[PDB]
RNA sequence: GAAAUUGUUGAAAGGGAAGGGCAUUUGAUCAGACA
RNA sequence: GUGAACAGCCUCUAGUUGAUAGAAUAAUGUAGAUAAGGGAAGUCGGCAAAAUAGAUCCGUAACUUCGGGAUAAGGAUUGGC
RNA sequence: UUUGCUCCACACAAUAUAGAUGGAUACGAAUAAGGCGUCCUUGUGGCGUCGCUGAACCAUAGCAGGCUAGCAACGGUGCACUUGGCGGAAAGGCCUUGGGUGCUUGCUGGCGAAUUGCAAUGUCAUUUUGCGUGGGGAUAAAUCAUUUGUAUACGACUUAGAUGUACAACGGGGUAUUGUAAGCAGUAGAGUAGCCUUGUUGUUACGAUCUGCUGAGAUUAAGCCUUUGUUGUCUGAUUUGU
């Protein structure tokens, strides 16, 4: 907890997220959900 | 105790070899195996069959394969009593592809 | 745990990005409920 | 003989940062212990009681030998050899007491307080 | 078989050098002297 | 063999596999390298480095002791089948 | 690792000591103002008193203080105990109850003391440690080695390891990186050959490249994520006490 109360306007701004990156950070990720992935590329040589 | 066992393992060399300087890789490869053998059998004493050596130096120094299928036979030592009563003996095992084979235990004779 | 990215609108009444989307980086700390197991009382002493 | 040497954890056993593993010493010293264990079995000493009582080592006459340094100059390049010597002994216990008896010497005003401490008290 | 210098053992001291002078406590050690 | 070639690079014959080792991979180095946007602003000074490069074809200035300058410059093309 | 440890008790033995020798005797605040007693209307109050040094106060007599009797008091005080209470600034000390007990020089007696020879500190404090005893009380860890990588030149740091949401070795699935494996087939292919039964796709093949099975194949923690599968390991070394 902070050691003074800030009237910073820049603080007190009541922010509200719109979107949160879920795409893998082990590369140049494109797809957030495996949903999104399977929905875009189609089906593969394993799979159904 | 002892136990007298033989099994057939694969080993990832590629992980244990990643980064290693070239002129040293295949030698590090040899050694890394010896290491691999005491991890499993418990034995300081570890011997490599000359074929397993070729099997290693198949592709020049820098060119070790990523995976190797091995036969680690643990046996009892003989003569002039070395420190430990046992030793290992690695042999290469003729597989088409070392991919995806997991560790089997060999029943002998 | 690491960081990721976020998109949110902005509320800086004045800035060229007022009521606009911006993308900000955010870390994320893993924070599973701590558990209370002891208590300590301290005292003022002319030494500290 | 330690300055500018490695540091290892294996030295906490003796309270010391700098510590080594000098093989070719070990092998020469333990090859001389081994020689006293011989002489002790041969003397009939109890091989369990044995403890090393004295093990000094000093310098043996050097060895010359040269080395070739820049601009056509010679430098010594010497072996540093050693005399070792050890002595083992049967450990043993106790020592009893036995010594003097202290020749007590006190003035006449000093035997007085004494022989009155008995007349007066316990 | 000296010294420089080194190993072991015995004693002693050591808060950014060590050694020295006058004096005395302490420990160790020693002469002389009584009759 | 590639190629203009006794070049470089790879191989046959023959000859070696000799040059203390082992484990790590901090700073600082030596030697090998890449780096966005800018492009000598760096520095005594482009020092260093980089750019160019073979061959075929097109094209080629001042000046000249008419022998040159000159691969001047500037350009295109280049595998495989 | 030969019965080791700790607190309470005594016993011997050491070793020390910046320096015992009746008592470190508790408001606070003011200083061109206060202490104390006392009265009252409880105030910046009335009245009185003191200072001018602690040269005070308390204690102090008894073989370095022995052994004894008694009276008067009903007090003091030393000790072990018990009751209730207070104290965190470093509290580790203060106070209070109740029995028991020693002493009392409050006062009056009986006895002792030499010969330490005319002084020789004439030895009475408290320090730390060690060795056995027996009266309670207690039955751990740390380090090396191995291991992780949130750390690292070496030491150091941060993890893990006695049977389980254990750990490692493979295998599986995710996540990535590349850009379509090998094989086989085709009426794809500039085209070239060879045997005729010289073609109403004539046939056997061959031909850089192309297409299909194929976003396939390969690689993926060595400092990625995960795991009901598979297999293996789970007590070596040394050190420490008030
Ligand atoms: Mg990433
Ligand atoms: Mg295996
Ligand atoms: Mg690397
Ligand atoms: Mg130094
Ligand atoms: Mg150095
Ligand atoms: Mg060093
Ligand atoms: Mg030299
Ligand atoms: Mg010369
Ligand atoms: Mg007396
Ligand atoms: Mg001689
Ligand atoms: Mg000195
Ligand atoms: Mg002196
Ligand atoms: Mg050399
Ligand atoms: Mg290391
Ligand atoms: Mg300039
Ligand atoms: Mg240059
Ligand atoms: Mg370039
Ligand atoms: Mg050009
Ligand atoms: Mg062409
Ligand atoms: Mg014991
Ligand atoms: Mg008052
Ligand atoms: Mg009143
Ligand atoms: Mg009043
Ligand atoms: Mg007074
Ligand atoms: Mg009297
Ligand atoms: Mg008395
Ligand atoms: Mg008295
Ligand atoms: Mg006395
Ligand atoms: Mg257990
Ligand atoms: Mg294992
Ligand atoms: Mg494809
Ligand atoms: Mg293919
Ligand atoms: Mg097929
Ligand atoms: Mg690392
Ligand atoms: Mg499986």
């Amino acid at each position: 907890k902070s050691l003074y109360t800030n009237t910073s306007r820049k603080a007190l701004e009541e922010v509200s997220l719109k979107w949160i990156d879920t795409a893998s950070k082990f590369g140049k990720g494109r797809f957030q959900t495996p949903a999104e992935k399977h929905a875009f590329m189609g089906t593969l040589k394993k799979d159904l | 105790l002892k136990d007298v066992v033989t099994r057939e393992y694969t080993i990832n060399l590629h992980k244990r070899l990643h980064g290693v300087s070239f002129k040293k890789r295949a030698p590090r490869a040899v050694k890394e195996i010896k290491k691999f053998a005491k991890l499993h059998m418990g034995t300081d004493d570890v011997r490599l069959a000359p074929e397993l050596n070729q099997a290693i130096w198949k592709r020049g120094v820098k060119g070790v394969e990523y995976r190797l299928r091995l036969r680690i036979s643990r046996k009892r030592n003989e003569e002039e009593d070395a420190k430990n009563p046992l030793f290992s003996y690695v042999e290469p095992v003729l597989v088409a592809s070392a991919k995806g084979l997991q560790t089997v235990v060999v029943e002998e004779d | 745990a690491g960081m990721t990215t976020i998109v949110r609108d902005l509320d800086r009444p004045g800035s060229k990005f007022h009521k606009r989307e911006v993308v900000e980086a955010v870390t994320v700390v893993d924070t599973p409920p701590v558990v209370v197991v002891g208590v300590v009382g301290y005292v003022e002493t002319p030494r500290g | 003989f330690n300055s500018s040497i490695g540091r290892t954890a294996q030295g906490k056993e003796f309270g010391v940062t700098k510590a080594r593993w000098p093989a070719k010493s070990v092998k020469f010293v333990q090859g001389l212990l081994q020689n006293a264990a011989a002489n002790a079995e041969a003397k009939g000493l109890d091989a369990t009681k044995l403890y090393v009582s004295h093990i000094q080592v000093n310098q043996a006459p050097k060895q010359r030998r040269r080395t070739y340094r820049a601009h056509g100059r010679i430098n010594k390049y010497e072996s540093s050899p050693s005399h070792i010597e050890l002595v083992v002994t049967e450990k043993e216990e106790a020592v009893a007491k036995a010594a003097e008896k202290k020749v007590v010497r006190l003035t006449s005003r000093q035997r007085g307080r004494i022989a009155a401490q008995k007349r007066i008290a316990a």
Side-chain angles (χ1 to χ4, degrees):
Chain A
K1 284 285 206 184
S2 215
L3 323 176
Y4 75 124
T5 61
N6 207 359
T7 328
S8 230
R9 181 104 153 240
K10 199 145 182 179
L12 318 143
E13 143 157 43
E14 287 152 295
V15 349
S16 341
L17 317 167
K18 214 180 262 176
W19 169 78
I20 304 175
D21 201 328
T22 335
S24 176
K25 281 82 183 44
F26 199 47
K28 308 304 198 77
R30 322 132 80 153
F31 306 138
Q32 335 291 297
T33 349
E36 188 162 47
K37 184 180 165 92
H38 186 287
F40 168 102
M41 284 198 311
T43 176
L44 292 172
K45 200 197 177 186
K46 40 193 174 198
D47 273 347
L48 315 99
Chain B
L1 299 180
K2 330 177 162 191
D3 239 272
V4 189
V5 241
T6 293
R7 304 177 190 85
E8 290 186 309
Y9 304 89
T10 67
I11 165 182
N12 189 4
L13 267 337
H14 192 206
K15 139 181 60 189
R16 301 163 132 101
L17 275 184
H18 183 304
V20 176
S21 159
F22 289 152
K23 242 58 179 314
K24 279 198 274 173
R25 286 182 103 107
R28 265 283 242 89
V30 174
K31 290 183 175 187
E32 205 67 11
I33 293 175
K34 290 182 164 193
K35 201 170 109 193
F36 182 90
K38 177 166 187 180
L39 191 126
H40 291 247
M41 289 342 179
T43 151
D44 278 284
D45 208 3
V46 166
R47 296 139 206 214
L48 311 187
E51 297 81 319
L52 186 269
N53 177 19
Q54 315 179 43
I56 285 182
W57 298 72
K58 189 47 177 295
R59 287 173 155 136
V61 251
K62 36 201 164 179
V64 199
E65 212 139 15
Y66 310 112
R67 299 199 165 75
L68 267 201
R69 191 51 149 174
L70 309 176
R71 169 180 309 280
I72 322 196
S73 298
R74 166 161 67 173
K75 303 180 181 178
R76 350 84 267 274
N77 196 337
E78 302 287 321
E79 112 201 343
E80 254 217 332
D81 18 298
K83 285 64 258 150
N84 276 54
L86 279 35
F87 62 86
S88 279
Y89 184 61
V90 181
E91 310 177 71
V93 4
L94 285 192
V95 70
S97 157
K99 209 66 230 57
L101 304 202
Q102 58 185 29
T103 149
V104 262
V105 181
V106 158
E107 282 80 21
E108 292 128 49
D109 313 83
Chain C
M3 41 204 82
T4 191
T5 340
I6 244 65
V7 190
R8 78 183 184 89
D9 272 322
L10 188 93
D11 187 4
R12 265 197 258 198
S15 203
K16 197 205 133 183
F17 255 75
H18 183 65
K19 293 234 256 291
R20 244 225 260 186
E21 316 191 62
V22 335
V23 358
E24 297 171 333
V26 282
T27 62
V28 171
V29 49
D30 207 332
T31 347
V34 83
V35 16
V36 170
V37 301
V39 74
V40 180
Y42 288 90
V43 231
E44 306 175 315
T45 82
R47 266 181 291 170
Chain D
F1 315 128
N2 84 327
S3 58
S4 287
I5 260 82
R7 283 142 125 203
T8 184
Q10 310 199 346
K12 307 157 151 185
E13 181 176 357
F14 321 89
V16 167
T17 26
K18 289 182 276 183
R20 296 209 130 145
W21 298 251
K24 189 181 168 172
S25 270
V26 187
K27 309 178 110 178
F28 272 46
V29 114
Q30 59 174 8
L32 258 44
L33 294 158
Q34 170 198 310
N35 181 271
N39 306 345
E41 190 94 328
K43 268 210 178 184
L45 282 343
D46 178 40
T48 72
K49 298 182 189 311
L50 259 23
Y51 84 95
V52 39
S53 124
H54 170 61
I55 181 175
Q56 92 181 52
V57 29
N58 6 14
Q59 315 184 42
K62 301 225 191 333
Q63 306 270 253
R64 204 52 176 250
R65 201 150 135 247
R66 42 215 248 139
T67 178
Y68 289 95
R69 316 301 304 290
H71 304 102
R73 286 175 310 110
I74 322 275
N75 275 173
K76 98 174 175 175
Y77 191 75
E78 291 192 326
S79 326
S80 344
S82 349
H83 299 341
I84 346 184
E85 75 177 30
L86 56 115
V87 164
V88 283
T89 309
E90 302 201 297
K91 111 205 165 207
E92 64 170 8
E93 327 154 334
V95 78
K97 292 175 185 173
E100 295 180 350
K101 294 175 187 179
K102 278 179 182 172
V103 48
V104 62
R105 292 192 145 105
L106 33 85
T107 43
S108 76
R109 289 144 292 93
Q110 200 160 11
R111 341 189 191 103
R113 218 194 54 138
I114 295 181
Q117 264 166 349
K118 21 191 89 297
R119 169 259 242 83
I120 281 179

